[PDB]
Design a protein around this ligand. Structure first.
Ligand SMILES: [Cu+2]
Ligand SMILES: [Cu+2]
Ligand SMILES: [Cu+2]
Ligand SMILES: [Cu+2]
Length: 502
């Protein structure tokens, strides 16, 4: 395998606006095929990148900043990863979704709002070339990536991901580590061929001869871990507090992160922004699309090399020599200035402070069937993507969604537009539910841990539990989506439209 901790962690440059005034900020980002070296010992890898970069440039905005991004497809007319046409026009379709964005529906990146190179062809829900992000939302770690119908797992794996940070000036007084000491960590697993080329499976292991070729697979587990586009990198840090914006940008893989010197993380934020109170953690789980906003305090570890370690398997136990490792910190950089940053306990209002009447309670079930080829097709509430819309909350109202998971695994459930509160999780009798559809609980409800007492938008629903969340649908109305954020599930076919009605 590739030798760990030999390349420095790249820090994506912050995107500069094409125009900027007090009233408006305007950016242009072009998707390009490009080559980048992912490890000291590899030939350059052919990739798809926003502005030809992997990851894409980091975009930083202020709360309420009036932002426009023209996202353009200048990709080749053919893909380089294996497309399975049996699961679902130009071959190469793209659309950018700002995940976590409180975004008008026609700038949200609907899967059928795709566009081919230079907008020559566009999907039936396409309305505009230049996306509008008003950013009228809490400070938080967002991220952007491709969301094209039936191609999301491939377009994202190709390299189309980047970070987007909203800064709320009202949080400045907290004096959290900032600027040079505030660093995104975009984690993506990949499998890389000897010649440096990306590998993505064209079929499951030992494909029945029934199977089409290529065939979609139900899960992707990469052999190698990359952070900010480099395989198992090191980062030289100063002996002081750092803030890290940790984003799982992987297709399937869930991570369970720790520090190998037994140091703590201080979680200050979740998907939807600052937690009410900081939380000291020795480890945390991070499923696809989740974000953790954390402080690591290197003050007491000068000289040390500390591995950000992973204990979660993907298709099997972790390998100590490979996917057990994420990156390495080296506490050897001289202090540029006194550490004047803080790690405050009191961060933000509780989500509970705000009282809301429950307009509706939906029960949703994670299910599926099997296709003519024998493959599993994963479905939300046994509906196809193309079935008439059933999730139709009213704008301005709050709902509890009760998500029933009788499957064998966790699924990270994501709703666009909104962030939400986690109410509780409760175990149930799976066999009974499958035979009769009757829900019998085998234990009391478990309220969220402190890490999930703030605002979330992507949430782990574990096997044999009912998960309840509370969301206020707004402030915009229109057509959005909800889906599993395991991309191999999302594309076949674990995604549904969501109408927020006025
Ligand atoms: Cu997403
Ligand atoms: Cu999203
Ligand atoms: Cu799933
Ligand atoms: Cu989505």
């Amino acid at each position: 395998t590739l030798e760990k901790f030999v390349d420095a962690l790249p820090i994506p440059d912050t995107l500069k606006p094409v125009q900027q005034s007090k009233e408006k900020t305007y950016y242009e980002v072009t998707m390009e095929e490009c080559t980048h070296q992912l490890h000291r010992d590899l030939p350059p890898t052919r990739l798809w990148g926003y502005n030809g970069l992997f990851p894409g440039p980091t975009i930083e905005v202020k709360r309420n900043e009036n932002v426009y991004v023209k996202w353009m497809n200048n990709l080749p007319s053919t893909h380089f990863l294996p497309i399975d046409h049996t699961i679902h026009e130009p071959e190469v379709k793209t659309v950018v979704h700002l995940h976590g964005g409180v975004t008008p529906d026609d700038s949200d990146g609907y899967p059928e709002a795709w566009f081919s190179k230079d907008f020559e062809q566009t999907g039936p829900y396409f309305k505009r070339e230049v996306y509008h992000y008003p950013n009228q939302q809490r400070g938080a770690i967002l991220w952007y990536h491709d969301h094209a119908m039936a191609l999301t797992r491939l377009n994202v794996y190709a390299g189309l991901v980047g970070a987007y940070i909203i800064h709320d000036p009202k949080e400045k007084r907290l004096k959290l580590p900032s600027d040079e000491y505030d660093v995104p960590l975009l984690i993506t697993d990949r499998t890389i061929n000897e010649d440096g080329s990306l590998f993505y499976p064209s079929a499951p292991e030992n494909p029945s001869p029934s199977l089409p070729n290529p065939s979609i697979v139900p899960a992707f587990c990469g052999e190698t871990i990359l952070v900010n586009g480099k395989v198992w990198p090191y980062l030289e840090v100063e002996p002081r507090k750092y803030r890290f914006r940790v984003i799982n940008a992987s297709n399937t893989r869930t991570y369970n992160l720790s520090l190998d010197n037994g140091g703590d993380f201080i979680q200050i934020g979740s998907d939807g922004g600052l937690l009410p109170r900081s939380v000291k953690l020795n480890s945390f789980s991070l499923a696809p699309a989740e974000r953790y906003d954390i402080i690591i305090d290197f003050t007491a570890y000068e000289g040390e090399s500390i591995i950000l370690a992973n204990s979660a398997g993907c298709g099997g136990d972790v390998n100590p020599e490979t996917d057990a490792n994420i990156m390495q910190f080296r506490v050897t950089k001289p202090l540029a200035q006194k550490d004047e940053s803080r790690k405050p306990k009191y961060l933000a209002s509780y989500p509970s402070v705000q009282h809301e009447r429950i307009q509706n309670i939906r029960t949703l079930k994670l299910a599926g069937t099997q296709d003519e080829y024998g493959r599993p097709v994963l479905l939300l509430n046994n509906k196809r993507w193309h079935d008439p819309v059933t999730e139709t909350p009213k704008v301005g109202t709050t709902e509890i969604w009760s998500i029933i998971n009788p499957t064998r695994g966790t699924h990270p459930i994501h709703l666009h537009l909104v962030s939400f509160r986690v109410l509780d999780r409760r175990p149930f009798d799976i066999a009974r539910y499958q035979e009769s559809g009757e829900l019998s609980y085998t234990g009391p409800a478990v309220p969220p841990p402190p890490s999930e007492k703030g605002w979330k938008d992507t949430i782990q629903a574990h096997a044999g539990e009912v998960l309840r969340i509370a969301a206020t649908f707004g402030p915009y109305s229109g057509r959005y989506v909800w889906h599993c954020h395991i991309l191999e599930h999302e594309d076949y076919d674990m995604m549904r439209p969501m109408d927020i009605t006025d």
